[PDB]
Amino acid sequence: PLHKVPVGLWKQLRLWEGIYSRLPRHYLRSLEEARTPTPVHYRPHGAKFKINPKNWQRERVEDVPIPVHYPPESQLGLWGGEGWV
Amino acid sequence: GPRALDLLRALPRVSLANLKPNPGSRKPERRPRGRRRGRKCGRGHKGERQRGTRPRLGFEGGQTPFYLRIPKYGFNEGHSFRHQYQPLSLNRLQYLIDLGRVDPTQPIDLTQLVNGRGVTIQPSKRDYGVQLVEEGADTFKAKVNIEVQMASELAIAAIEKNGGVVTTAFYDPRSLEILCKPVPFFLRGQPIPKRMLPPEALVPYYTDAKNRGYLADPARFPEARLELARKYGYVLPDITKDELFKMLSTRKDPRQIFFGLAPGWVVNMADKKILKPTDENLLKYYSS
Amino acid sequence: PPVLRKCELPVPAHRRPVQAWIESLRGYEQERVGLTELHPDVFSTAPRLDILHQVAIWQKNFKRISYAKTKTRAEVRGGGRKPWVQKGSGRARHGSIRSPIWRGGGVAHGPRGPTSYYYMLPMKVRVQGLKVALTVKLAQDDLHIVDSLELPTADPQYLIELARYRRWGDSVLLVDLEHEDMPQNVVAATSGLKTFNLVPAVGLNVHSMLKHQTLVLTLPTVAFLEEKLLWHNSRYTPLYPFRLPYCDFP
Amino acid sequence: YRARPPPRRSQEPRWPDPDDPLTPRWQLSPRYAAKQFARHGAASGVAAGSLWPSQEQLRELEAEEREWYPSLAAMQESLRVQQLAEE
Amino acid sequence: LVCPPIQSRTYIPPEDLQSRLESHVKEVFGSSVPSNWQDISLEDVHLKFSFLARLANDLRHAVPNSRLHQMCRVRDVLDFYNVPVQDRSKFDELIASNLPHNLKITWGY
Amino acid sequence: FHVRVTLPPRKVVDRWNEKRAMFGVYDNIGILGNFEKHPKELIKGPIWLRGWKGNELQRCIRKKRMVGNRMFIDDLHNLNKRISYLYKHFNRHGKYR
Amino acid sequence: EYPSFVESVDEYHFVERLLPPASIPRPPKHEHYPTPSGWQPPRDPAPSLPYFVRRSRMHNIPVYRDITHGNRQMTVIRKVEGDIWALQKDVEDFLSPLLGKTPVTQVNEVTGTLRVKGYFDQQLKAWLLEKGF
Ligand SMILES: [Mg+2]
Ligand SMILES: [Mg+2]
Ligand SMILES: [Mg+2]
Ligand SMILES: [Mg+2]
Ligand SMILES: [Mg+2]
Ligand SMILES: [Mg+2]
Ligand SMILES: [Mg+2]
Ligand SMILES: [Mg+2]
Ligand SMILES: [Mg+2]
Ligand SMILES: [Mg+2]
Ligand SMILES: [Mg+2]
Ligand SMILES: [Mg+2]
Secondary structure, three states: OOOOOOOOHHOOOOOOHHHHHHHOHHHHHHOOOOOOOOOOOOOOOOOOOOEEEOOOOOOOOOOOOOEEEEEHOOOOOOOOOOOOO | OHHHHHHHHHHHOOOOOOOOOOOOOOOOOOOHHHHHHHOOOOOOOOOOOOOOEEEEEEOOOOOOOHHHHHHOOOOOOOOHHHOEEEEEHHHHHHHHHOOOOOOOOOOHHHHHHHHOOOOOOOOOEEEEEEEOOOOOOOOOOOOOEEEEEEEOOHHHHHOOOOOEEEEEEOOHHHHHHHHHHHHHHHOOOOOOOOOOOOOOOOOHHOOOOOOOOOOHHHHHHHHHHHHHHHOOOOOOOOOOOOOOOOOOOOOOOOOOOOOOOOOOOOOEEOOOEEEEOOOHHHHHHHHH | OOOOOOOOOOOOOOOOOEEEEEEEEOOOOOOEEEEEEOOOEEEEEOOOOOHHHHHHHHHOOOOOOOOOOOOOOOOOOOOOOOOOOOOOOOOOOOOOOOOOOOOOOOOOOOOOOOOOOOOOOOOHHHHHHHHHHHHHHHHHEEEEEEOOOOOOOOOOOHHHHHHOOOOOOEEEEEEEOOOOOOOOOHHHHOOOOOOEEEEEEEHHHHHHHHHHEEOOOOOOOHHHHHHHHHHOOOOOOOOOOOOOOOOOOO | OEEEOOOOOOOOOOOOOOOOOOOOOOOOOOOHHHHHHHHHHOOOOOOOHOOOHHHHHHHHHHHHHHHHHHOHHHHHHHHHHHHHHHH | OOOOOOOOEEEEOOOOHHHHHHHHHHHHHOOOOOOOOOOOOOOHHHHHHHHHHHHHHHHHOOOOHHHHHHOOOOHHHHHHHHEEEEOOHHHHHHHHHOOOOOOOOOOOO | OOOOOOOOOOOOOOOOOHHOOEEEEEEEEOOOOOOOOOOHHHHOOOOOHHOOOOOOHHHHHHHHHHHHOOHHHHHHHHHHHHHHHHHHHHOOOHHHH | OOOOOEEOOOOHOOOHHOOOOOOOOOOOOOOOOOOOOOOOOOOOOOOOEEEEEEOOOOOOOOEEEEEEEEOOOEEEEEOOOOOOOOOHHHHHHHHHHOOOOOOOEEEEEOEEEEEEEEEOHHHHHHHHHOOOO
């Protein structure tokens, strides 16, 4: 048999029920939106479109963040948004 | 008509009970049971193959494979970016006009050809449109206003002699897709986009009156046009004095996809209404 | 008053239409209440039992989804471990005790997953199938064009005995033009019957026509079918789906 | 017996709950709204003015179009130079 | 609401056929008979319907829906009604066919 | 090989029950219905299987793409393993190459 | 801040052009037959022959060619309503003076179809035109 709601949404609908419902709305709206963190270790290319050097064609290009690990001792200080690669 | 019907009075009801697939329709499958198809069951004996493990397709048994000893050469090189023009012979055009699929009375562009199913465009395959080829040149008697994306001297010559007009226009891939299947686009709920210009390689094509390019200087048209007569030895008619002339002169804006509609409008097909932007910025963008 | 029905669509020059009695359902005794022309390209089509077969089989199968599942030696409960050592124990060598050889073990091939049998016979073939079914129902005398469908009463016994008096056979398929417009006497009578079945035009199909011994078509129903089926001989291949705007087409 | 009522395609405009988490994110798009307009559009309850690019969207379309699609004059100029160098 | 007892469909043509059919030719078409009365065409639907319905109530026998495309002249209706139709089965045809003494058939249905 | 000694209760199937009498009724819904609904719509079944078909690998692969995140752990794991198996088998094994 | 718009019904006849027909148009009457592309319509009456050949939905004569195994060339005559055996007789009597021998044939009586060995497609369209089908 199947779960009616996808498990990825089990974290979210955990917050729509119980005591989390009674939390102040501004707080929940500060947690909801995850803004993309400023690039630190990887260096981003500005353009959305980039001409393929080999091909000579206009290519769509995206920026993919490099996963960085933050040891818990980084939570005691301020490391400048960076951490272990 | 069908004398078969008269044999059906005599015979029992057609029911679900007696129904035969046409003989030969089903070749019966065979299973590895019994003395014939059992005992090694068509798999041979031992080795790699009876066990089902023989190597991949190109593999030659360790000697350098045939498809890899041959050297690489650009053949299909950049194939995806080559332009593709679907050919339309004058023979097919004539045959379509004769049978009343496309009518020569109103102007003929890509949408008209597609709607008569005289031609099929698939932009996803990088079709840039129809090209006109001369196969039926001698036989061609029709009088038409035609717009294609490419044409041959001979084809043009064969259309002029009959008192029509050819013009080569360009459509970019998006434009093209919209052009060929307009009604699927009008359900899309988007404005009518600008027609893009041709890329730098194709500019010397559409700027020439030789090709009767849509970007060409009309001053050269009546000159070059007459030239085509001297070569093929026929009297060039005066298109001006004809009764259908107002239709024959009909162009598109180089920035327009259709006839009589304009970039930036919106077609609401349920209300049978058109919607146009009153905004200044929008009107500057769409009209540029 | 004689009810005479002329065809509403062009017949080919080389072919005359076909004719059938218009029967009325009100009296037991009124058998021929009128005269009708049916179109030769629908009811006179060359009988094709081969295509009938294709379409009946299609109707049967294309809907079908088998939920029959067996566990492979992978999905069975346990037996990740070699039940004894490869050599010296003196007996046959085995990996998992859930191997398809073993008693409780996994099934070697067997049915797998919910399976769909789904396919589409090309349009023109299903159309042709319908034409042929109609043709054959007619040629074998088992098709009856009825006017009306107004019934004198809601007693189903009336209907049974009516079918007995006209020798209609055991089962009867009553086709009506739309679902809401069905007369209430009919609906009452036919809701309590097993063999007599009332169905709207859009629910006409090959299977049901071969299941019931006798077909009864309303007059507007004929005028409907004739047009719907005939439409396909003259039509282009679809550019995009027909549910979208077309020039002439609804 | 008598058959069920025939299955029919409702031609009314269809709007899914924007607040129901079980709803697919493709049916919440602007694109879905526009399509819902082009299907009906009077009865849709879609603002027609919503079918055009915003000031932001328009400025970006503008910027992009001016970047990757040159002027006719700019291109003829571009070609004459190449032809010159080849000569 | 009563139900009339079913007809047996067993049909033999009567000797008066020609006269019945020509009388119906005259009264249905309302026409003084053109010299050949059996060769007149049934193409009109009023005339065909009235003619055949009258034949049906007179002769206690009707033309089946399949054969109604087959009747053009009146000659066709003549020829149709000349041929008898037995509603007895093959079995029932064998009971009455004068069987030898050494063959007994018993019906066990 | 011992065979059952008692005649089973003879099962009477009436073919005129509702489900059998109404079978295949709306199959022509597209043609006769001025095409709006394709016969696919009539198909009652698993979500990933409606109006679609394919060999066991394709089937599994599709099930995972559609409902794979609504699945129970054990069943998802089993599915992944089945997919991997079928992949290896179809691609690398057989007579015909 | 939705920009302003204007609703007019008057250009919609330009959209009406773009709708494709779902049915195939009956061919236009001409003043001269055969037409430039060589298409000739069927006759006003139909011949007396005990068979008939329907036109294609596109109004052409249903004679096609077919290959199999790359070397087997055939010609199919389709949509034959009538005594097909008649048509077989006439077709082999027509083709015989060409090959010196009777052409090999297959008659499908249920399909309403004739099938001939070799490519005779042109000459057969000509011959079926002459008989006015
Ligand atoms: Mg097998
Ligand atoms: Mg063997
Ligand atoms: Mg053995
Ligand atoms: Mg061995
Ligand atoms: Mg060996
Ligand atoms: Mg193509
Ligand atoms: Mg295991
Ligand atoms: Mg282990
Ligand atoms: Mg031992
Ligand atoms: Mg092992
Ligand atoms: Mg088990
Ligand atoms: Mg072939």
